[PDB]
Structures are given as structure tokens and as C-alpha cells.
Structure 1
């Protein structure tokens, strides 16, 4: 089984224990670690953070301890204008220059592959995404003639039904990618004046309008569209989403006035790292959706939807039963990487729980 784990560049700037450097990553925890977000300048892949070149080095040294560990660099991301990706891929001239620049860059900094994080191509881009993947892979195949291990090519893909149909020719890109990570954790969040869970595993017989907004449906849909199970990786979040209650109602369908208050360390409205949630739980009321099989907690006027060891192991058992390639974890830096916030002095409690299930099966 594969255990793909993302590490984010900006997590280094979090104050106190919140600060996370590649240095803190256990070399034997994940099978693949992806450094989150390279930029594109002059139509060539390039660094993002001022000290990325150093961090790349720190991350890749982990391979000295675990020679089997693979690392990839992800291009794109949320702060990267999709319109920018669109303009690059749409023009053969720009596209070819970008593709040409990747292998040398990856080789120079010690990466074993590239992860495409074009966050949301429109319907006009679907065709160009396919071309980008095909041509990028053809270049990786050609570069391997030089005697080195062929570069890996992966892509992060949203799990939303509409998003998939609109910009992804799954049947086509699946044959060129080494693995596809399904972002099965963005099924809810703010845009609606109601409370809800962003990463439910199952539909939950309750509501009906959105029988497509759960992990099980997304996985089944990808399998139907042509993505081979041995190339599909299910995304499991290590963070939680927070909301500010508009009333004293906390049950399903409770009104919302907006995202929750920022966390002490992550300082981003609407999200909390798992280590922040562990602190939040003290004095909070915990609940769990039996149908969706995911928990949520409330305190004062704050409502949090998250994943714990149990929900995470459950999702791991699920992808195993569906014979998928493995699991993907968004943000090792959002898990209790120090292991000093969530009681048990266990570092990476969420990621380790996933590894445990995958290790059994």
C-alpha cells in the first residue's frame, strides 16, 4: 500500500511549537512525501519560498535514513491562479517550455517526481489538461533513457462530482499518471449558512440532495470513469473545519454566520490543525455522525467538523476493502507532529493510525 503525505512550505512560519520543518518528518512513516507548491515563473517550474532550496535539501536528506522513501514536488496549489495554469497549458509554446524545465529542476534538487496540483480546470481546460499530462509523461519517459530512474507523475484531483465532469478526462489521464490523489475532504465549508461535515465517508440516509458529497460516492465514480483502483489514492484530512454558530442550535442543519475563529497556531479562519483540535476538545461536547462515520465537537458558539483516530482508521479500512492503491494525507504539519498536544506522547497520531491499518491490510 502507498501512504502519500503532503508537507506545506508555509508551515515553517507558524510560531512556537506550531513551526514545522521537513526535519520533523519520520522517514519511515510515509512511502511518499510531497513538498507543497513550487511556482511557475518565465514559464518554468521554480521555487516559491525564499529558503525553499534549503528546505528541499532538508527534506531529501530523509532519504539517507530511508533509501526507499520517495519525494515529489507539487506545482500549483490554491494561491496559484488557475487562470495562470490555463494560459500555460493552452499554448504549445508555453506548455513545452514548462515541461522541458521540470526534469532538470527535479534532478537538481533531488526529487523523484512531480505532482500536478492544478486546482480546478474549467470546462474549456479539460482538453489542455489531458495534453499537459500526456506530454509531461512522454518527457519523463524520454529523460529516463539517460540511465536514471524514471520520474514519477501524479496529480491531485477534487472529489466533487461537478468538478470532475467539468475539467477532468479521467479515463485518459489515468493511463499516464503513476497515481491520483482524491481530495475527499472538501464536501462542505462556509459557502453555506449551515453546519456540516467536509469529509463524510458515507452518504448518510438523512439528507438526499447531495448523495454525491461523500468519499464512497467519489471513489465509486472514479472507478466507473476508468481510473484503475491500483492508481487511486484516497485523501484523508488531518485538519478540521470550524464554524461560528448563528444560534444555540448544534444538531444537523444548524444555522451559521461564518467560519470559526482562528486557531492559536494556524491563524486561519475556518480551519484548525489536529493538534489545535485536541486542545479545543477540553470542555467541548463531542458527537459523531453514525451514518457518515465522522465526528464533530462544539463549545460556546464554535462548531468543529474533524477526523480522529477512529474515523481515520475507518476510512483506511474502507480503501483497503475497495483495493485502492493507498491513502493520501493532507499536511503532516497539521497532524500532532510533535506528539505533545493530544495526550499520548505519540507523534503523528492520525497518520500513524492510518499506517497501522494499511500495515495489517
Structure 2
């Protein structure tokens, strides 16, 4: 029963032209869960991050109206949110607990199936405990709300980093595994525009060339590191990106892995952030005159370059290769960032939703067992 958790970004509705994505562009039979990103905290209380995000929460739910087994979650936090609103939330108990109690109310008001807690990232010994405390009080209050109210319990999931260094620094893995329904490993952003050398967003395996250090910055090593630190395989949802990480090359003749980069690459027309492109933006890039598509047979992922623009991404083949690895490793399913950056319109010339469809196909008939 492999689970497929799909993140829906709220800000995708603000995209121009075709890029614009709304909750009813979602194929309600694709994913097993849809997670809406993100909400915020208004004085340590879970709330809408924008005034008529509200009607969107209502639109993203009632995807259930056409798939009643579909679970809809609300996400809190994310990258831009930072760590500060979480240290505050968890600095004292009345604050944290009244957040829990009121979040349930909030969640039930909108008829969300659960909460995805995305604190990026706890660091150090007291952040470690605050994170476990937060997860414990929420999970326990959820359990205890189900038997006072008599409804199916609210779900508790959390997104977690890939880096082994990040795991040690902020994550008591046996403890959070205990309270989380689902552990969403963000096995992407291994390399990107913060770096001055070309590297791939999401390599499954490393180059044989690689330093022992970077042999660790792979989907395979990361997911396994989590298993090593206590994580139950059936709760491990391995992250799958539908975007690629792009670079501007210092020199056009140097396009290989490790090639010097001045920084991020040209923003896509619709996502408007230099450093990455959606998959439908990748497709246009591929269609352009003399773009060179390269398959990395060691890393099992593709990248492509034209002139001084270089992008490493996931396609149908690499994602299926990862599904074969995941079934072989016995993981409980996948997490997708994000449903709105897959080619949902089918403009790439393949099917509609070609990336998530590919992963679905390869997961068919897979039962996770122990």
C-alpha cells in the first residue's frame, strides 16, 4: 500500500498564463495525500498566511468530493519561514499547548485530515527536544481528540532533511518516528545555486569519482541514513522533485559535473526564481535549438545544457529508476514536491502529469512489508 504524498504550493495560483495552478488542476486519483503549503503562525497560532488563502483551503479540500479516500493536509513552515517562529512556539508550554488545542480546532473547522509540520531546521540539543516535544503533544492531543470526539484521528506528518549532518544536528529519529504518521524525506536540493560548481539536484547514486563526503549527498545514502538512525521503513516517504536546479556556467566549454558556476540560472517564465525550473519549463528548455541532453549513468539522473545555462533534473526514466530502488529498499512510499511543477497540462508532449504518472506506474503492485 505505497503512499504518494503530493505537496501543493499555494503561490502557484499566482503564476502567469499556463503556469497558474489551482486545486482543481489536481488529478484526485494521482496522490494518496495532498499537502497544502504553507500556512503561517499569527502570534503562535496556526492561521492562513493570506486573506483569501481561506477559499483555497476550501477548494483543496473537496478534492475529496471526487475521491473520498483522498487525504488533505495543511503544511506549516517551509524554507522561507525559517526556524525562529518554531523556537518561539516551543519556548514555553502554555504557548505550545494552546497552539496544539487551537490548531485542532482550526484543522477541524476546514475539515483537514492532518497537519504537516515543516520546521527547517532544528539544530542543537534544545531544538532537538523542542521538536520532539511539539510532535509529541500534537500526536497525543490528536489521539486524545479522536476518542473524545469519535472521528478518525488527525494525521501527523513532517518534512525532514536529507543531509546526514542535518539529521544528527536536529533529529531524535527514534522519537519523532514514534509520533509521526509519515516521515517526508526531502531527498533533493543536494546541490544548487548556493554553490559555485555545477551539481545535480537529486542524484540517486554518486559518481565513482566523488569524495567520500559527497558520496553521502545522494538519495540512496540519505534515505539509508534515516533507516540507520531508527526510522521505520514503512513511514519513510522518499522525496521526489518535479523541478530541477539550474546554474549559470562560467564557461560554455565546461558543462560537466563540477564545472565552475557564477550562480543560479535564468528563472523560468512562470516560476520566476533563478536557480530552479519546473518540469514544464525544463521541457521548453530541451526543445530549444541545440540543447544537449545528457544521461548520467552513475548518478542515474539527467541534466541538460545550452550555452551558459545548465540544469539537472528528474525525468520519467530517473524517477522510475528511483522507484525500482525504493521498492527494493522497502520504503513505504514517496513524497512529491510539487504537484504543480509537474507538467500538469501535458505541454511536454508526453501524458498529462508525466512525472507523477511515471512513478505511479512503477509502483503498481508494490506492497510494503516487514
Fold in common (TM above 0.5): yes
**The one of 333, 342, 355 aligned to 2:348:** 342
Q: TM-score, normalised by structure 1?
A: 0.98
User: 3-state DSSP class of the match of 1:222?
Assistant: helix
Partner of 1:122: 123
**1:88 equivalent in alignment to 2:89:** yes
Q: How far 1:314 sits from its partner (Å)?
A: 0.9
Matches within 5 A, 1:111-190: 111-123=112-124, 124-145=126-147, 146-190=149-193
Verify the 8 A CA contact 1:116 1:154 in the aligned structure 2.
yes
Residue 268 of structure 2 is matched in structure 1 by 263
Aligned to 1:40: 41
Match of 1:67 in 2: 68
- Match runs of 1:299-338 below 5 Å: 299-338=306-345
User: Where does residue 224 of structure 2 map in the other structure?
Assistant: 220
Contact 1:43 1:94 in 2 (8 A): yes
1:194 aligned to 2:197?
A: yes
Distance in 1 (CA, whole Å) between partners of 2:199 and 2:328 is 26
Shift of 1:98: 1.1
Which of 277, 280, 285 aligns to 2:282? It is: 277
Residues 215-237 of structure 1: CA deviation (Å, up to 9, x unaligned): 11111111111110010000000
Q: Is the 8 A contact 1:9 1:49 kept in 2?
A: no
- Taking the aligned partners of 1:125 and 1:59, their CA distance within structure 2 comes to 32
DSSP 3-state at the match of 2:216 = coil
- Say which is worse superposed, 185-194 or 298-307, in terms of deviation: 185-194
Offset at residue 97 of structure 1 (A): 1.6
DSSP-derived class of the 1:74 partner: strand
**Do 1:338 and 1:348's aligned partners in 2 also have CA atoms closer than 8 Å?**
yes
**Matching residue of 1:8:** 9
**Is 1:53 the equivalent of 2:39?**
no
Q: Does the residue aligned with 1:90 lie in a helix, a strand or coil?
A: coil
Alignment length, in residue pairs?
A: 359
4+ residue runs of structure 1 moved beyond 6 angstroms? none
How far apart are the structure 1 equivalents of 2:244 and 2:353?
15
Q: CA deviation at 1:81?
A: 2.8
Query: Which of 212, 221, 237 is the matching residue for 1:233?
Result: 237
Work out the CA distance in 1 between the residues paired with 2:82 and 2:293.
Answer: 38
| Gaps in structure 2 of 5+ consecutive residues | none
Question: 1:157 and 1:286 mapped to 2: Cα distance?
Answer: 31
The TM-score, its normalising length taken from structure 2, stands at 0.95
| Match in the other structure for 1:22 | 23
CA contact (8 A) 2:189 2:245 kept: no
Counterpart-to-counterpart distance in 2, 1:186 and 1:275: 19
Per-residue deviation at 1:325? 0.7
Aligned partner of 2:215 among 200, 211, 214: 211
Q: CA deviation at 1:347?
A: 1.3
Q: CA deviation at 1:252?
A: 2.1
Structure 2: distance between partners of 1:281 and 1:83 = 40
Contact 1:184/1:235 (8 A) holds in 2: yes
Query: Could you say what the CA RMSD is over the residues aligned between the two structures, in angstroms?
Result: 1.0
Rounded Cα–Cα distance in structure 2 between residues aligned with 1:352 and 1:70: 19
Per-residue CA deviation, residues 242-281 of structure 1 (Å, 9 max, x unaligned), is: 1000012111221000100111111111010000000000
Q: Residue 360 of structure 1: SS of its match in structure 2?
A: coil
Distance in 2, Cα, partners of 1:98 & 1:115: 14
